[PDB]
Ligand binder design. Structure first.
Ligand SMILES: O=c1ccn([C@@H]2O[C@H](COP(=O)(O)OP(=O)(O)O[C@H]3O[C@H](CO)[C@H](O)[C@H](O)[C@H]3O)[C@@H](O)[C@H]2O)c(=O)[nH]1
Ligand SMILES: O=c1ccn([C@@H]2O[C@H](COP(=O)(O)OP(=O)(O)O)[C@@H](O)[C@H]2O)c(=O)[nH]1
Ligand SMILES: [Ca+2]
Ligand SMILES: [Ca+2]
Lengths: 123, 272
């Protein structure tokens, strides 16, 4: 499902400030990463990225296309293609703790300025 | 005859845009007797200072073009523009290169006429209000500001995709658009970067005047998101000097002059 900026911000509140990344920055990163589509599926090649966070099967989730994956998040990549973001968030936190915000390539070029536009004012 | 008024008296404001009834380009021609071979139109009433080449990147989107032409020709004539329509068709089946095709359009359109304004438009976006003039302004113009696919709201302030217009001088100023963005996304952000590096800001109509309809469609093969887009967008400052109008190379395979547009099929190479 294609979510809205506020739907996302409300859904991922628990990640605010984690590893120093704010909600504004996450709202920005996720828009550019998956357009807020929880069912986004994209390749580079030889590997595939899933969901809102575009979590890759190369090292993070296990996919049928690459069952030998390290599967660091301990999860089927299909669990990253639905509207329940709790498991996507736990996996993203692992990536953040292990690799860092740099996993998300849109952060630097797109989310280094004009962060205020990403604010959600809906209680 | 004298200069056209700053605002056109023929404008009707909001319009109902739907893709239900199939389009017949033949009827479209009938309904637009004043458009000349190659999709050229020049006001007979007054003199327009806007010599606009409308450039559309294209490949296997003939059905969308029909709707585009069906709606835009009436609109552009109402906007009193001295315009020409150019559909740059990418031959072959390599990754789509939108920005490179837009550069081809710029150079090719200039062979036909002394254009001073270039509108670059996706083949599937139709403006819903004719007050959203398809022409150039003092600053680069972002036209499709309120797309129904984005909830009729600009996705982000630095967004420059969809439909935009650069005067000839603004375009020359940034060395045109990049030729190295293959596959989907990022090229519009690189263009935004280029404009900003040259000290320009983005001019836009408000979100009501800028309402735009998108023709929903399945994604095309050969235009999958570009894996290098974010890394490329972060280096525009340096690559814009060496990748643009000045490094553009392509081969023309065919030029078609139809009554509603000029379609140039080109071989623009492959990712290198
Ligand atoms: O096979 C193809 C692919 C693309 N196009 C042309 O390229 C435009 C954009 O491609 P898509 O419609 O698939 O992509 P988006 O709808 O996701 O478009 C948005 O993202 C693009 C990113 O590369 C541009 O920035 C574009 O201006 C912006 O509206 C099309 O409208 C069309 O004019 C074709 O004609 N055939
Ligand atoms: O101004 C125009 C443009 C196109 N066509 C019709 O559209 C067809 C196909 O045009 P084109 O080659 O651009 O389409 P493609 O074959 O590439 O789908 C023509 O043969 C005509 O029947 C027309 O009648 N008037
Ligand atoms: Ca999930
Ligand atoms: Ca589209």
């Amino acid at each position: 499902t294609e979510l809205t900026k506020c739907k996302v911000s409300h859904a991922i509140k628990d990640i605010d400030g984690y590893q120093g990344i704010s909600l504004l920055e996450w709202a920005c990163v996720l828009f550019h990463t998956s357009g807020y589509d929880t069912q986004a599926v994209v390749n580079d090649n030889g590997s595939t990225e899933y969901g809102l966070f575009q979590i890759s099967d190369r090292f993070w989730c296990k996919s049928s296309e690459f069952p030998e994956s390290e599967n660091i998040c301990g999860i089927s990549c299909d669990k990253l293609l639905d509207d329940e973001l709790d498991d996507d968030i736990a996996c993203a936190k692992k990536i953040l703790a292990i690799k860092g915000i740099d996993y998300w390539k849109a952060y630097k070029p797109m989310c280094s300025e004009k962060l205020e536009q990403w604010r959600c004012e809906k209680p | 005859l004298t200069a056209c008024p700053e605002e056109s008296p023929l404008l009707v404001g909001p319009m109902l845009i739907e893709f239900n009834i199939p389009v017949d380009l033949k009827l479209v021609e009938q309904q637009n007797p004043k458009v000349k071979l190659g999709g050229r139109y020049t006001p007979m009433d007054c003199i327009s200072p806007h010599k606009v080449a409308i450039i559309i990147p294209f490949r296997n989107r003939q059905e969308h073009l029909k709707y585009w032409l069906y709606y835009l020709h009436p609109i552009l004539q109402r906007q009193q523009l001295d315009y020409g329509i150019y559909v740059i068709n990418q031959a072959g089946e390599s990754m789509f290169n939108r920005a490179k095709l837009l550069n081809v359009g710029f150079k090719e359109a200039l062979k036909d006429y002394d254009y001073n304004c270039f509108v670059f438009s996706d083949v599937d976006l139709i403006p819903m209000n004719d007050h959203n003039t398809y022409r150039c302004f003092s600053q680069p113009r972002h036209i499709s500001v309120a797309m129904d696919k984005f909830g009729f709201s600009l996705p982000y302030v630095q967004y420059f995709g969809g439909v935009s217009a650069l005067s000839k001088q603004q375009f020359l100023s940034i060395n045109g658009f990049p030729n190295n963005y293959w596959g989907w996304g990022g090229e519009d952000d690189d263009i935004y970067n280029r404009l900003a590096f040259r000290g320009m800001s983005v001019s836009r109509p408000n979100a009501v005047i800028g309402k735009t309809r998108h023709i929903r469609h399945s994604r095309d093969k050969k235009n999958e998101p570009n894996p290098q887009r974010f890394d490329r967008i972060a280096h525009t400052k340096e690559t814009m000097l060496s990748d643009g109008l000045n490094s553009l190379t392509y081969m023309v395979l065919e030029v078609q002059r139809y009554p509603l547009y000029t379609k140039i099929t080109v071989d623009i190479g492959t990712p290198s």
